[PDB]
Symmetry: D3
Subunit: 274 residues, 6 copies
């Protein structure tokens, strides 16, 4: 049982990771500046003995004593404040590697499938601390994820179809809707992160869901699961064999169950905003 | 139309203050470290042209350019030291800021001076006398309304929750003691009147209308419409009436209704 | 035998605290910024092996290794309101941080006037005791006189002694039937020491419960000075807790303490001629 | 006539840039920590009125007053962390400086973007968009000439070294090389242009490695036995009126003269 | 009428300098860490409108706005070297930022840190255009001087007041020249407000023998003390460039200094 | 075998000391800001196991771990010079204090500015902080890597001689290897008081000029140190014959000029 720092812990992925590691009996310390995350995402844990929330910006040196660091502190966007994003990914990662070096923590970087800005150099910084300072690093290349606590108003397709469907709005299908998307449910991703953190694989690893559907196939499925009278209008798949083999990991959450849950969250939010 | 800093802006009173000053077409900057306040209390304004949210702890020096400062950054109740540092070091910093850029500063003091909020007042008058800073001091009494802290064990909060949760209403004593409660919009109006007046001495902002603890328990039980059993076990604003022409105008029932709506919509969200 | 930090150690009360503890063979270190204190009040120890003066301001972090801190640093007034407050608040936090880090016991020299910055300083100590386990001691001190007191504060005692020595009229406001309790300094100093070495963390009044009337003080001093000064018209301390918890109580009789304060005021007035 | 900061000014390209801007009577200030550059590369200008050398690390904040900044502070290749810090933090600092004093900033980026120089480009455009800083971005391709690194194991360096020292020339295809003064011309044109988007600065003319070793073999004149992405600059030609004018032979002669005067000094 | 900083202002010479410049209606600000000086040397001025006392160590950067600086701040051998070097740099840094003229109270002892201090002054002058004046001060005496330093004037006065024997090393034929403090302060002001940027000696050319001194002091005090046995300054440059010279007759100065030592000795009862 | 810090290591004397201490298998760390020194003076050692070059200004605090410090960091820019000699020197004594290192001050025969107080600062640390210190009072040295363009007499005659330029008093010159041997001898002894390290052997301004004229082979037209304390306390003395020393210095002046055509 380990003392774990999660930067970006109050965000979409960070909060679900937090829930998981607290249930597993670890001392989870969350660092977040609430630039894109929410205190509500982790409030359930405030006061519990093995939890602590620190309102800190990773661009500022952080001194704490831990065995692991899940480095997830990076804002997402539809880029809202490009300079702050670039500062966070670079200076932010250097500080968390500095911290990892001083106290001997293993650090996992939440990288992105978008490497195929600031997250490219971030991977490189990890590998430079590994090679040069003996820091243990793990690098996850994360693909499209969805679920409760995701950003609803970013203009991604899952968020759009879910909002439009709940609001009786027409579901806007760009193109012929034959193009394809692959979505992983957040608990699968969390399972992947933990597995990669505790493996011995220091090279990059893709965590995504290889199963694709057509954008339209998605729109019809969301329409049904919501049960709205909404109308439909018109206007790089992940390879996870390295995770299947090295980590014995793969997404197991059926798509319908993942969407049901995301929908329950979008519904709860929309009524709350009344 | 003025550039206004509201420290503690993301809290209960601070957020309602924010709404009103944005509706009036001012440039509002909210500073808050979210120790007791919430981003949700101000999210409606993020992105808006005349608005900005800064995640800053007032215990740290803050450099910004403004004409007014509503200094409300003080936690309610936990971490007694952080509280004392905030009321003292925080207040010194905001006055330093008021001094350097010539802003008028209003301190959200409390009827509890009749810790750290006493010295804060003293610190304000010392900057006025010694450095010519313009200061205003509001002595705030019991307030309630949407976005208040539900789980503090305050009486309005307990009764609304118990009534909403079908639970019995706990009346300590015979419930004949009395309380005076002010609705949040009334307080916000009062604060603005005090900020823009010429009165630098302390001014009470509260509601003189008193009710019995039991009348409150009874009134809330009815406005909620709960089958809850009831079990058993004053501000003087005449200086505000005359110097500011201010007074609470929200009838108790209307205020309680809005607050009950908030507690409910909240309880549903946490299900 | 201890290592003791006295902040404000060059002031009226500080210097006599320093005298006693020094004579007791402790490692006394004085910290003072001479705002209202005087190098002369300690100079007698400069050079001696177990003493050290450090020109420091308590609003600035201080790092040092001690067993105890007698925190007496707060300027006397009749002056610079902002500085007094930063000192009572920021200054006290630092010495409380200092006591936390090195495990020192901190005695706060508080005041009877709590019945500014002094009130929240008490709170600041009890906050650190609860939250951080710092051992704190809180003394509520009452009117104090003696050598090295401030002479031109226009307190009643300094005024009567001043006017008396100068042959001036003694100015008694109203009928002088109002009353004051005064405590001699060595009594206060013994009380602080007893307090700092007891197990009482709750506040302990230190004062002289023996009241007198303003007219009587003026009369008595007049008699002790033997001047041709004409008199012209224009909350008691409860120390039972200290008697019971510390076996302490003022034992220096008024006139003896008055004589001594007269001898100091005289020596000064001559020096300044 | 402008006050100009050149980071990495004491380096291979930085120094040739330095020469030309001085000759033009500007107040050139060079910043360099001598991690890969050499004081010798700029010593001639020390003392001249319009010149100054500051031994400073761009990873540390720099407060100075200029109209322009040529940001060339990037090590060539060793110490991966210092390199990444230099490229990211160093660059942020220079944009901050550019932001505070209203200086125009040109980034000496690399053809290798087709590390830390990618994000460096991005940081620049974010300051353009967010803080209104004027930025210019040059994508530099293989350059050669006097003051180049002789012992990097690049091919031009190898063949010259091997040839002068009678060594066999190790030919393991085509490469396109640009002479350093042409690049300098480009840098200056782009800096004073209005093109804020990226511009390639390189020489499109290719030869085979064997063709090179032979040209070098002859230009040096040794009996050494030989053993065993082209740049598109049409955008510079059109927006800057720039193009390489130094013939490959003339450029190699100059580089060979440098390597020859260096080996002798190390005898 | 000028805003004047006096480092070491709370010391022997600094306070007399402080006095005279306050008498002249200037805004005098004193900086002192009370390492060798006393709040008493200047308390007479605390509260006055044109005065301020700042408890500051010149080894720490100091930011203030002034037209002049009399740098007299000089006293544990290391603190001494730091004060003379770093202290002086800081005061020149300040002089540069605010365009103040700076006077260095150097010493006749250059014929440590006061040698290099001079070099630093001329270096800021030459390189940054800071205006500097440099006084080479010879032996000074008077009220508020250090009594227990073991100087000869100090010893003889103390021994004489206390009936102790007056300890004269050698046959007492060696010679010393002593300047009274009020002369020196005038000397300092004349040099500050001249255009002479080169060094200037401020001392009393008048010499006497040590034995001659002990006898003069012995008479002016009137004690039954027994006498036991066990570089003259050239101010011609000051006479001509500043029209300055000591005017306090030796007797009058010694009288005043003796009064101070006496008043102090009773006070210490 | 000792971990040695050498400030000014990239300078004329600092580098030869650097060479000689490396050949001896010590862990040499050079601190230099390249104000008057050259990276080239030490590049030969870059990469080697017992060596490190650090670009640091001694006026800024330096934190490192060593057994010894040869403080030669001293350079035109008078303020910077005085700052380097005073604050620079305080730091190296501060550092020597924190890590218990022995410190050597490369002082100069000119104490007979900023190098006077340096001596003064060192002894204050010895006395007050028990820091062990050594002080060498160095006279005029010559050799490869010297500042050629200083206007010293040997330098002037060599430049004039090496360039066909036209060229009764005594000047005493010490060769660099001699100085270096002397410095190490002073470092690893127990004499903490000042020691003159120079060459007592004198020649005439006129002899020198005649000697240089011939050693170059051009058509060119034409306070003595007391080291008895060093001879005795360190058993040290200059051994490099004047001609051989001049030859090496001349060879340097030549290689540089050609490098500069
Ligand atoms: N969501 C995806 O599909 C996806 C895809 C690729 C990569 N990722 C990576 O996973 C991580 C989490 O993504 P997410 O969707 O949960 O994003 P998110 O916006 O929900 O969470 C990021 C969290 O980091 C915090 N943060 C941002 N800047 C910070 C700073 N300077 N200091 C401290 N905290 C800061 C934010 O407030 C937020 O709570 C990110 O690093 C992201 O790049 C996610
Ligand atoms: N609500 C009442 O009944 C009442 C009564 C008397 C006085 N007041 C005063 O009115 C003001 C508003 O109080 P409230 O009840 O809305 O409390 P609140 O907790 O809702 O608001 C306090 C806000 O200030 C912020 N804050 C706390 N510490 C801070 C720090 N160090 N730096 C920056 N921000 C910080 C908190 O996050 C919070 O958002 C307070 O000053 C309070 O003392 C309120
Ligand atoms: N004398 C009384 O009758 C009386 C009554 C009640 C309380 N007290 C308390 O006793 C304590 C001492 O009082 P006193 O009569 O000795 O007053 P004093 O003024 O003689 O002593 C205060 C000392 O603290 C020093 N000081 C002030 N600010 C400082 C700072 N920021 N840093 C360092 N030193 C600083 C002053 O120079 C002075 O020497 C005080 O805390 C006071 O409030 C005294
Ligand atoms: N050589 C090429 O053909 C080529 C190709 C692509 C890009 N570039 C770019 O051109 C620029 C110069 O290239 P070059 O061959 O002249 O490189 P170089 O190594 O000759 O020069 C880089 C200079 O920057 C200095 N420097 C490095 N880190 C520093 C720091 N932290 N602070 C201050 N100074 C620092 C070095 O000491 C050196 O003099 C670089 O940005 C490089 O990326 C060159
Ligand atoms: N008295 C003489 O005969 C004589 C002779 C030659 C030169 N001087 C020079 O005149 C100047 C004043 O002499 P003095 O007799 O008044 O000496 P002094 O010790 O009486 O005065 C020096 C003052 O400077 C202060 N000081 C010392 N170090 C300080 C620091 N780091 N920061 C701030 N203040 C500090 C001391 O507290 C003291 O008040 C000195 O520079 C001295 O070198 C005096
Ligand atoms: N060579 C001589 O004739 C001679 C004679 C007597 C004394 N000395 C002394 O020996 C020492 C070295 O002499 P040199 O002839 O080798 O000089 P040099 O100029 O060749 O070397 C001095 C070195 O110190 C470095 N330096 C300067 N300021 C610095 C700072 N602030 N931080 C770090 N490094 C800095 C310079 O870059 C230079 O490399 C000097 O202290 C000098 O005074 C030399
Ligand atoms: O630039 C360099 O040459 C050096 O950079 C780093 O050293 P440094 O960057 O000084 O310190 P790090 O240990 O890398 O720390 C990096 C950053 O993390 C921050 N940090 C450090 C420790 C910590 O607990 N928390 C924390 O936020 C510090 O602010 C620091 O700026 C490397 O560790 C060295 O190998 C490298 O040679
Ligand atoms: O101690 C003293 O004697 C002096 O203390 C203060 O001066 P100071 O605290 O230095 O500066 P202030 O402007 O009073 O600032 C108070 C605090 O506010 C902070 N501050 C200042 C300015 C600002 O814009 N923002 C800000 O957060 C500073 O960190 C500072 O700690 C008083 O203003 C002076 O009257 C007083 O004489
Ligand atoms: O604000 C908070 O939440 C924190 O406030 C304090 O921590 P902090 O004020 O950071 O540090 P302290 O150790 O209490 O020191 C207070 C001050 O004393 C000063 N200090 C500390 C140690 C020392 O030896 N000397 C000294 O002057 C420091 O400058 C510091 O500003 C409490 O100790 C923490 O429990 C609390 O979590
Ligand atoms: O090192 C250098 O090359 C430069 O050193 C100095 O510049 P610097 O010492 O950085 O700044 P100064 O203006 O000389 O200030 C010296 C000291 O004075 C102090 N200072 C400065 C300004 C002030 O208002 N008050 C004050 O006490 C500062 O703490 C600083 O450490 C010289 O001014 C330059 O001519 C020189 O070229």
């Amino acid at each position: 049982r380990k003392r774990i720092l999660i930067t970006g812990g109050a965000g979409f992925v960070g909060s679900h990771l937090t829930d998981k590691l607290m249930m597993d009996g670890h001392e989870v310390t969350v660092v977040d500046n609430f630039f894109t995350g929410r205190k509500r995402n982790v409030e359930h844990w405030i006061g519990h003995e093995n939890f602590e929330l620190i309102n800190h910006d990773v661009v500022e040196p952080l001194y704490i004593e831990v065995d692991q660091i899940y480095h997830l502190a990076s804002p997402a966007s539809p880029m809202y404040n490009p300079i702050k994003t670039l500062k966070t990914n670079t200076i932010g990662t250097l500080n968390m590697l500095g911290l990892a070096k001083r106290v001997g923590a293993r650090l996992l970087l939440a990288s992105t499938s978008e490497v195929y800005e600031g997250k490219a150099v971030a991977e490189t910084m990890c590998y430079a601390y590994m090679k040069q300072e003996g820091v243990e690093v793990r690098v996850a290349r994360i693909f499209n994820t969805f679920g409760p606590r995701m950003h609803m108003n970013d203009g991604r397709v899952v968020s759009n179809f879910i909002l439009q469907a709940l609001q009786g709005e027409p579901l806007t299908v760009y193109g012929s809707g034959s193009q394809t998307r692959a979505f992983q449910y957040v608990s699968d991703l969390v399972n992947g992160l933990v597995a990669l953190m505790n493996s011995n694989v220091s090279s990059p690893v893709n965590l995504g869901n290889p199963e694709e559907h057509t954008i339209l196939e998605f729109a019809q499925l969301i329409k049904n699961l919501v049960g709205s009278g909404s109308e439909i209008q018109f206007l790089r798949k992940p390879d996870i064999k390295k995770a299947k083999l090295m980590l014995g990991w793969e997404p197991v959450v059926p798509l319908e169950e993942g969407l049901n849950k995301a929908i329950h969250y979008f519904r709860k939010e929309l009524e709350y905003q009344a």
